[PDB]
Design a binder for this molecule. Structure first.
Ligand code: CDL
Ligand code: PC1
Ligand code: PC1
Ligand code: PC1
Ligand code: 3PE
Ligand code: 3PE
Ligand code: 3PE
Ligand code: 3PE
Ligand code: 3PE
Lengths: 318, 169, 70, 347, 98, 104, 114, 105, 80, 96
């Protein structure tokens, strides 16, 4: 009975990741004054299926790898972490109700850079490794503000428990006391998943994404679907964290409908940010972290430490 | 078998240490230390150190071993007898210790060791509406004042020291 | 026009609705028509194990009220 | 280096030493050693040449290994005592590991193999800090754990340190390696008397720090790192040859000088406890230390080695170095033997 | 005593004898040093959770923080050695024999 | 237990996807194709070390939502603002001594 | 060393309070209001003797006064109490704040009839 | 050179984490609080030399509380004899040691 | 000081908001009238058990029952 | 809004903790009789197992004191089945 619940978590994750590619190509189509796919299925609904079947019967590209073991383990680790980030998410009930779900998700997302690092090791090109080290330095840079913004918000929650964060936001959305934390959170999660305007691997400002370079890389579909699982998950986590919905304990479907609509709007906001801006240069998003976001994050961290003490609004532990 | 879960994770822990400590390459040594840190985190989690195990994942594996793999990637080159021989040496020493302490429920290498499952030594009471481990860690700010002062001073000095010795001038 | 993106958004929305609705219905099926007991603290687990021992069927979710006392 | 950053980093070295000296908890002892190493690493890399990076790497590896063995000894103590007070250790395995860790931190033999390399690789001021100030905190911990120190272990480390520091300096022509092997022999002398009377241990440590500070200050003021560069000192500043003469005669343990005071008090407190063979062999082994000290006095003060022509230009310039406390340290390293019962202030 | 303490101490000694027997790479030495720290972390944590000694729950965190700052210092030393000699080999650090 | 079952299930589904994605495109026999140190940067290593040290400072900051529940609130607030201030002072020394340059 | 002295299984026989935790938590405020004196005698004996073998008679008096409490609920207000602990019992955290009208009915009937 | 600055100035820098019987957050007892309190209140003031030979029983009870070596050795003896009697067939396990008796509360 | 403040607010407003939020976080709890109530609420939250006292004969402030008048009260917390 | 609502959450936490406090004497009485039940069962089965063993004191304390020592997990669940062992010794940790 529990394995049924695990599978009804993880298989609709993969189906939602499949149709996020359709939603991306359509919404980026209409924002670019064109259409997205509408030929392959009715209104494009067979495009993820056709594209997945195409990617699964396509040849392994040309080259060989430096390390077979890490070439195998990097997509395994990427997909495993991308699936385990969903199990403490209270929607309205988490699959694995743990006392430290926030800290669990922060730790498992900190583990996600090893897939990038091991895919940089496993490629033969010494330039793809440099691109991987740039990506690792980017992701570990924005994990700092993820941790401190998350701590500053949890000072109004009382615990690391994700299910308590529904109870915390019963009177107001938590974006009202913490909107600067919320906007730096949203941009930092955008910079976490290598998502535009922070996608330097998939774009220019890159020493190796330069057309007729070497570097045996993994099967693209696995890292791609791990990345879109991470995108939907970080938007659901932002929805739980700042825009927490009404929960009737006798009707859980009201909360599920409400957080689902908000998470869809927030993922479409990712789609609408990537179709609106040019890319940062690498030192420009290093600037944006280290000289812009981190001073405000430390200042608001001091503020959200000292603020429940001065307002007599310290939340309960339980 | 399932009452011996912390013991089996500790055997995987020692096997991973024999793995990376035999030193094939700093890349695979880093991988072995990652798998070892994960299973030792599971050992800590099965006593009720949930925060301390997530400190292992978030801090040890999350920051420090990421920086080790990062710095290895800048210092090694991507493309034996002694490594595999020392690996099977440590594996045979560990399994002979396992076999002795299992068939005898007793061993003495340096100290005397029980051979039963380490479930036996636990407490039989509750902690109420808190974790004792969480409250003891929370007391770093009310009881560990001097400890916070020296730790923050060492970390600030550490930032200063790294900027001195990597400057080259 | 722009309502052509709504079938894909609707399919993705149903796919996000399935996990939460699924875990709520499975928690109510596995726990006697009620919410799953949350035991974050050892007192909550103590009361839950006491419920499991007083229910007589080795199930914490079989509630015994005043009909169980004389 | 920025002088502000230099002053803050030296205050952090001193802070780690003070945290070891005042704290009653083993974690804070370990924290003090960590802070001390973390702050002294830039002092060793003050000049940024490959010998300083090699010396700092070797120092890091040895002190890191010793700090981890120290924490393992502390953890075995927490097993077998359930507490953390910095006092005697409640297990001979924890006592053995902590004595090994402090022997590695002091560079006593057979863990001595870093001290001449690291002392040669670093400047004279950082070598002075390493051979005087970095001896303070592990001797304080050994002063506190001595009800549990194994006697055979500490005396094996002591006599092996005295013998290897005697034979090591006989082959040397670099001054920093001579001072490092002198350090190994004198640390053997300090730890040999520790379980018998640790007040004489503190007396040996204080007289040693005075004399080593005198020799490193003379070597800084003359800018001499080798024997043969020290040999030109008579044609440059002849008073410096006199001062290095009397200080090397002091460190050899000759009366009426104050370097005779510690070894005479150590022999004095080891014969009380019915040990005769051991202070006699220690005293006879210190004649090797006296031999390479007399080699340096022959090369510097008692003969006149040939100089070169460019010394005539250096005749026209005075020393503008801050020879800080050099007359005070020269007087205290030589003329203190009439004040030998002053040692009771360390009781 | 308890059975898991044997394996955690034996893990410390395995990473010790790895750290005390270099092959070529200084990075593998630092990996063995932080494996020693990892085994010390687990051993201290199991004692403190087993004893219900509440205030020492902050002890392994202070151990982890100090020794990871120590590891950062060692990685910076390795980086300066690698910028000197091109590799991180411990047989390149032999200038101080004379 | 249910956590371990879920981790094993996620690891199994991930390994199954990886094994399919490597072995399913090997079904179609293809034409066998017969035709035919990295530079160090100090700034890349320095941003990783700056991450590590600020991450240790964050590891000090993580017990704050439990630390606000104490009865010694003035000491707790002092040490909390002091840790965040020392993180800011580490950032200011990293700023002003040209440490955040060309990866700003 | 010496032999540990344990009470017999006859001395551990008592009529238990075989209700669920939501039944206790629903009744806990009136139980703390009404069953004060044997409970505090027991907890004083328990923190002073530091031995559960010297506290068995006070434990039996606690276990008897609790039964008198629930019998006195059962004679007067069985149905509002049953509705109230069912509403407490639905919640996974057993919130008091989800159940204020059933608490109001139970407190009204308890204040009137008892 | 234990310069006892803490007792000189009256500051409490690290005496609070030093023992298990100290003041704990929310008055949480250590599992060997009484044994450590007995050993400390025995050994207080008389020095290490008198404390090792005059407070030996309190320290042995406290070490056996901490490590539980005699307890685990006693359970090993009972469990090995029980398994030998089960293999020889000369002993049956009771229903209350098999999960057949509807536990107490 | 008014020229410098407008200049740093024109050139580096992120740092001005940073130092302003940090300075308010420092000096504001000593000026707030509700900082007393944070301490009062944290010391009134009953984690442990209220281990009762042996009635020796002279404890006039200690109640005999929880609903007795004497003893510590939380009417300030119900009202605020 | 967070001020009003976290003050309400603190008052609700105090109400929950007072319910726990009002139930702690009954739970402590049941827990005391529980552990004395299990120790008496272990003592009787130790008396009927350890008969052939020479020089065995049944119920012998491993402590020199006559003070009550809080029982260990292995002292209570030592002779019972592995399922009850797991449910008592890893149950809260492995719970969900
Ligand atoms: C108690 C323990 C004291 C330990 C030593 C403390 C001082 C040294 C540490 C700091 C340091 O290096 O300062 C420079 C240091 C001089 O050392 P230097 O670098 O070799 O300078 C040599 C030249 O004389 C520099 O000459 P100058 O031309 O630059 O200026 C002359 C200078 C100008 O003087 C001043 O400026 C002083 C007036 C201002 C003082 C500070 C006010 C703030 O006067 C002197 O230096 C005269 C000599 C002073 C005595 C030096 C040694 C002190 C005694 C050490 C302990 C001996 C114990 C023997 C025990 C034997 C039995 C075991 O000290 C001073 O300048 C002032 C000394 C004051 C001594 C007070 C003693 C009692 C204290 C209670
Ligand atoms: C959760 C749901 C979503 C949340 C909202 C997010 C949706 C909107 C997203 C829009 C698209 C963004 C795409 C990526 C953009 C990245 C670039 C960018 O914005 O850089 C940030 C820029 C970077 O600066 P810059 O590069 O623009 O400016 C130049 C910077 N210097 C001078 C250093 C060269 O600004 C910030 O860093 C601002 C961060 C958040 C600010 C929070 C303000 C708090 C104010 C408090 C009061 C202040 C008054 C004074 C004190 C009073 C005290 C009482
Ligand atoms: C579940 C997620 C989606 C998964 C993917 C979608 C499901 C379908 C999976 C099977 C796809 C069809 C079989 C593999 C592709 C074959 C294409 C091809 O060119 O085959 C030629 C190959 C080889 O044909 P050939 O012998 O003419 O080789 C041509 C190449 N030369 C001449 C140069 C050597 O066919 C096969 O190997 C047959 C494979 C099995 C056929 C199907 C059996 C059932 C499979 C289930
Ligand atoms: C730099 C100094 C920063 C800390 C300033 C004082 C902070 C504080 O509230 O300390 C009180 C705290 C705690 O005092 P307290 O008043 O909370 O003590 C009550 C007792 N307990 C803790 C059990 C509740 O610290 C001390 O009193 C002593 C430790 C710090 C001593 C000063 C260190 C100076 C370091 C200089 C280098
Ligand atoms: C949680 C929700 C998840 C939802 C996932 C799916 C989203 C999209 C839903 C489907 C939308 C409509 C799809 C219509 C596809 C085309 C059907 C069709 O008729 O294709 C024509 C083709 C050839 O037919 P032919 O015989 O040549 O006709 C000539 C007529 N004189 O005929 C054929 O090719 C043969 C018939 C093929 C039919 C395919 C239908 C779609 C299958 C998709 C796979 C998933 C199914 C759902 C699983 C989850 C729900 C249970
Ligand atoms: C390259 C190798 C392969 C890579 C892919 C696969 C590995 C990587 C992805 C998996 C990572 C696993 C992380 C699992 C632990 C996370 C921390 C944790 O257990 O948190 C949940 C919870 C804490 O909450 P709390 O409520 O306080 O505790 C329950 C008490 N009521 O605590 C609990 O619920 C405790 C439950 C019991 C303890 C669980 C222990 C799990 C098994 C051991 C570790 C397994 C992973 C080892 C490898 C890691 C990566 C190398
Ligand atoms: C139980 C014991 C408790 C504790 C008791 C006290 C122990 C005292 C231990 C003393 C250890 C001293 C170590 C050396 C000083 C540390 C700071 C330092 O390095 O100062 C030297 C300074 C650096 O200048 P810089 O320019 O970097 O050097 C290159 C040359 N241009 O400047 C120079 O290089 C200029 C050259 C002269 C430097 C002379 C410094 C002498 C300092 C020591 C005095 C003697 C010790 C005190 C008296 C005895 C105490 C026991
Ligand atoms: C008795 C003392 C030793 C106890 C452990 C013995 C383990 C087996 C190894 C024996 C020695 C083998 C050897 O030659 O090791 C040297 C090797 C470094 O040499 P390398 O550079 O790899 O090759 C050139 C050859 N000199 O060094 C290594 O390979 C170091 C590997 C150490 C890892 C230890 C693993 C656990 C061993 C058992 C538990 C202790
Ligand atoms: C007192 C409370 C506690 C205070 C400590 C806590 C602070 C929390 C925030 C953390 C900030 C971390 C980073 C701080 C670095 C400061 C140094 C700095 O940034 O100087 C450089 C800057 C000019 O920037 P530049 O170097 O050119 O940058 C490249 C793009 N041009 O130079 C400048 O822009 C000038 C910077 C100094 C002047 C800022 C004045 C702000 C005033 C705000 C109102 C008053 C607030 C109270 C605090 C006192 C401020 C004087």
């Amino acid at each position: 009975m529990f394995m049924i619940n695990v599978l009804t978590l993880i298989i609709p994750i993969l189906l939602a990741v499949a149709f996020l590619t359709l939603v991306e190509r359509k919404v980026l189509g209409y924002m670019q004054f064109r259409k997205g796919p509408n030929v392959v299925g009715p209104y494009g609904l067979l495009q993820p299926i056709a594209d997945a079947i195409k990617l699964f019967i396509k040849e392994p590209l040309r080259p060989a790898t430096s390390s077979i073991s890490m070439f195998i383990l990097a997509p395994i680790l990427a997909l495993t972490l991308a699936l385990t980030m969903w199990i403490p998410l209270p929607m309205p009930y988490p699959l694995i109700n743990m006392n430290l779900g926030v800290l669990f998700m922060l730790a498992m997302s900190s583990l996600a850079v090893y897939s990038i690092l091991w895919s940089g090791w496993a490629s033969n090109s010494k330039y793809a490794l440099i691109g991987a080290l740039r990506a690792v330095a980017q992701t570990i840079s924005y994990e700092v503000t993820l941790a401190i913004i998350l701590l500053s918000v949890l000072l109004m929650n009382g615990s690391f428990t994700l299910s308590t964060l529904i109870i915390t936001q019963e009177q107001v959305w938590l974006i009202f006391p913490a909107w600067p934390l919320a906007m730096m959170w949203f941009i930092s999660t955008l910079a976490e998943t290598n998502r535009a305007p922070f996608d330097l691997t998939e774009g220019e400002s890159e020493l190796v994404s330069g057309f007729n370079v070497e570097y045996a890389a993994g099967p693209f579909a696995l890292f791609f679907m791990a990345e879109y699982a991470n995108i939907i998950m970080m938007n659901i986590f932002t929805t739980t964290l700042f825009l927490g919905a009404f929960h009737n304990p006798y009707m859980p479907e009201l909360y599920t409908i409400n957080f689902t609509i908000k998470s869809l709007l927030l993922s479409i906001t990712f789609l609408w940010i990537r179709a609106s801006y040019p890319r940062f240069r690498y030192d420009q998003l290093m600037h944006l972290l280290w000289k812009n976001f981190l001073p405000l994050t430390l200042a608001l961290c001091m503020w959200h430490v000292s603020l429940p003490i001065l307002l007599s609004s310290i939340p309960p532990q339980t | 078998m399932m009452t011996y879960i912390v013991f089996i994770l500790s055997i995987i822990f020692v096997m991973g240490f024999v793995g990376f400590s035999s030193k094939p390459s700093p890349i695979y040594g880093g991988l072995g230390l990652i798998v070892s840190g994960g299973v030792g985190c599971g050992i800590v989690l099965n006593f009720g150190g949930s925060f301390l195990g997530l400190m292992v994942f978030l801090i040890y594996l999350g920051g420090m071993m990421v920086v080790f793999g990062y710095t290895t990637a800048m210092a090694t080159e991507q493309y034996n007898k002694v490594v595999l021989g020392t690996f099977i040496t440590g594996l045979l020493m560990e399994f002979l210790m396992v076999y002795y302490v299992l068939k005898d429920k007793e061993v003495e290498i340096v100290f005397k060791f029980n051979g039963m499952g380490d479930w036996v030594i636990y407490d039989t009471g509750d902690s109420g509406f808190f974790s004792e481990e969480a409250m003891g860690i929370a007391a770093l700010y009310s009881y560990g004042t001097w400890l916070v002062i020296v730790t923050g001073w060492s970390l600030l000095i550490g930032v200063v020291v790294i900027m001195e010795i990597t400057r080259g001038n | 026009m722009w309502f052509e993106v709504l079938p894909g958004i609707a399919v993705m929305g149903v796919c996000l609705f399935i996990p939460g609705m699924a875990t709520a219905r499975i928690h109510r099926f596995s726990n006697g028509g009620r919410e799953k007991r949350v035991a974050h603290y050892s007192y909550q687990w103590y009361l839950m194990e006491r419920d499991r021992r007083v229910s007589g069927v080795n199930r914490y979710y079989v509630s015994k009220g005043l009909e169980n006392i004389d | 280096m920025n002088p502000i950053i230099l002053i803050i980093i030296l205050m952090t070295v001193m802070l780690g030493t003070i945290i070891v000296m005042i704290s009653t908890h083993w974690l804070l002892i370990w924290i003090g050693f960590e802070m001390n190493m973390l702050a002294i690493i830039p002092i060793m890399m003050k000049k940024h040449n490959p010998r300083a990076t090699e010396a700092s790497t070797k120092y890091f590896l040895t002190q890191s290994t010793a700090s981890m063995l120290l924490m393992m000894a502390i953890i075995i103590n927490l097993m077998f005592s359930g507490q953390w007070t910095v006092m005697k250790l409640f297990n001979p395995m924890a006592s053995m590991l902590m004595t090994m860790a402090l022997a590695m931190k002091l560079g006593m033999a057979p863990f001595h193999f870093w001290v001449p390399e690291v002392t040669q690789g670093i400047p004279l001021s950082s070598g002075l800090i390493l051979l005087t100030w970095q001896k303070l905190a592990p001797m304080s911990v050994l002063y506190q754990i001595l009800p549990s120190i194994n006697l055979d272990l500490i005396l094996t480390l002591s006599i092996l340190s005295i013998t290897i520091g005697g034979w090591g300096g006989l082959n040397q022509t670099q001054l920093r390696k001579i001072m490092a092997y002198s350090s190994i022999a004198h640390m053997g002398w300090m730890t040999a008397v520790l379980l018998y009377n640790p007040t004489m241990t503190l007396l040996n440590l204080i007289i040693y720090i005075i004399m080593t500070s005198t020799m490193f200050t003379l070597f800084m003021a003359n800018s001499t790192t080798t024997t043969l560069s020290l040999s030109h000192t008579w044609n440059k500043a002849p008073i410096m040859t006199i001062l290095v003469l009397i200080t090397l005669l002091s460190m050899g343990g000759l009366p009426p000088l104050s370097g005779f005071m510690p070894k005479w008090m150590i022999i004095q407190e080891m014969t009380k406890n019915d040990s005769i063979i051991l202070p006699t062999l220690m005293a006879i082994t210190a004649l090797l230390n006296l031999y390479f000290y007399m080699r340096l006095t022959y090369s510097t003060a008692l003969t006149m080695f040939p100089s070169t022509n460019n010394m005539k230009m250096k005749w026209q310039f005075p020393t503008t170095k801050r020879m800080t406390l050099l007359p005070t340290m020269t007087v205290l390293s030589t003329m203190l033997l009439p004040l030998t019962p002053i040692l009771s202030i360390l009781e | 005593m308890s059975l898991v303490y044997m394996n955690i101490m034996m893990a410390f000694t395995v990473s010790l004898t790895g750290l005390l027997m270099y092959r070529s790479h200084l990075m593998s030495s630092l990996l063995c040093l932080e494996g020693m720290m990892l085994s010390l972390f687990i051993l201290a944590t199991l004692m403190i959770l087993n004893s219900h000694f509440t205030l020492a729950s902050m002890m392994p965190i202070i151990l982890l923080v100090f020794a990871a700052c120590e590891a950062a210092l060692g990685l910076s030393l390795l980086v300066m050695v690698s910028n000197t000699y091109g590799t991180d080999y411990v047989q390149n650090l032999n200038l101080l024999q004379c | 237990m249910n956590l371990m079952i879920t981790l094993l299930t996620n690891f199994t589904l991930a390994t199954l996807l990886v094994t399919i994605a490597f072995w399913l495109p090997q079904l179609n026999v293809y034409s066998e194709k017969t035709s035919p140190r990295l530079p160090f940067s100090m700034k890349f290593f320095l941003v990783a070390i700056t991450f590590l040290l600020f991450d240790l400072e964050i590891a000090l900051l993580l017990p704050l939502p439990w630390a606000s529940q104490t009865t010694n609130l003035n000491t707790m607030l002092t040490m909390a603002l002091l840790l965040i201030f020392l993180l800011a002072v580490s950032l200011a020394y990293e700023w002003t001594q040209k440490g955040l340059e060309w990866t700003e | 060393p010496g032999i540990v002295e344990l009470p017999s299984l006859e001395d551990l026989k008592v009529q238990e309070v075989k209700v669920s935790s939501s039944v206790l938590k629903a009744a806990a405020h009136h139980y703390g209001a009404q069953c004060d004196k044997p409970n505090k005698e027991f907890m004083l004996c328990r923190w002073e003797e530091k031995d559960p073998r010297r506290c068995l008679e006070e434990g039996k008096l606690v276990n008897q006064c609790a039964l008198e409490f629930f019998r006195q609920i059962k004679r007067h207000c069985a149905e509002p109490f049953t509705e109230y602990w069912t509403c407490i019992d639905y919640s996974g955290l057993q919130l008091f704040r989800r159940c204020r009208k059933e608490q109001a009915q139970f407190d009204k009937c308890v204040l009137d009839k008892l | 050179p234990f310069f006892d600055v803490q007792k000189k100035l009256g500051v409490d820098l690290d005496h609070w984490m030093t023992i298990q019987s100290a003041e704990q957050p929310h008055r949480i007892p250590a599992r060997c609080h009484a044994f450590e309190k007995e050993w400390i209140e025995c050994a207080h003031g008389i020095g290490s030399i008198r404390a090792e030979k005059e407070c030996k029983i309190e320290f042995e009870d406290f070490r056996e509380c901490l490590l539980r070596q005699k307890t685990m050795k006693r359970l090993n003896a009972i469990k090995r004899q029980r398994d030998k009697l089960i293999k020889e067939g000369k002993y049956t396990p009771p229903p209350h040691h098999s999960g057949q008796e509807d536990l107490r509360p | 000081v008014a020229a410098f403040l407008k200049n740093v607010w024109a050139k580096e407003p992120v740092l001005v908001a940073s130092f302003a939020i940090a300075g308010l976080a420092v000096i504001l709890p000593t000026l707030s009238p509700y900082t007393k109530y944070s301490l009062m609420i944290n010391r009134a939250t009953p984690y442990n058990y209220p281990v009762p006292l042996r009635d020796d004969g002279n404890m006039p402030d200690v109640p005999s029952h929880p609903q007795d008048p004497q003893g510590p009260s939380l009417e300030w917390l119900k009202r605020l | 809004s967070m001020m009003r609502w976290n003050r309400e959450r603190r008052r609700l936490q105090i109400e929950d903790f007072e319910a726990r406090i009002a139930l702690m004497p009954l739970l402590q009485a049941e827990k005391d009789r529980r552990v004395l039940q299990m120790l008496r069962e272990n003592l009787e089965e130790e008396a009927t197992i350890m008969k052939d063993v020479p020089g065995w004191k049944v119920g012998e304390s491993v402590f020199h004191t006559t003070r009550w020592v809080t029982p260990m997990m292995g002292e209570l669940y030592g002779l019972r089945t592995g399922e009850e062992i797991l449910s008592s010794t890893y149950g809260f940790i492995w719970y969900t």
